[PDB]
């Protein structure tokens with residue numbers, strides 16, 4: 001049930017991620033947050049993020065997730081419209097790989113979790 005088991009190829013991950021990353025770069029809006037973090041650790045984010053999309057609940061007992069994201073709401077004025085932004089980009093990513101909509105619809109559900117979202121706003 002590992003990521004590799006889903007794609008069945010390592011490189012597939014390099015490109016899959018590279019595609020998203022390249023897109024996240026164009027959006028200088030969300031980049032405002034990646035100002036403190038370096039470009040090195042940044043990529044790692046798009047990796048663990050693009051993973052949780054496929055329901056990679058391997059290990060995510062929150063707790064730290066909140067605090068980690070909390071440091072943001074402290075300095076950066078994070079909001080909801082922000083989550084919908086990065087979330088959309090992902091949708092356009094799967095559209096480039098020529099993937100049916102029905103399949104892309106389920107993906108939205110996974111990330112459409114109310115909890116994960118509530119964690120961002122920290123409440």
Ligand code: HEB
Pocket residue numbers: 030033034037045048049052053060065068069072082083086111116120
């Ligand atoms: C929603 C799918 C989502 C998840 C699951 C997620 C997960 C992480 C994890 C595991 C880290 C690493 C924490 C650590 O290693 O200590 C992480 C770091 C950061 N994240 Fe996110 N994140 C999710 C969603 C978002 C959204 C939306 C963000 C805002 C654009 C966002 C930001 C960040 C940032 C800035 C970091 C780096 C924190 C740091 O330690 O420097 N994440 N995220």
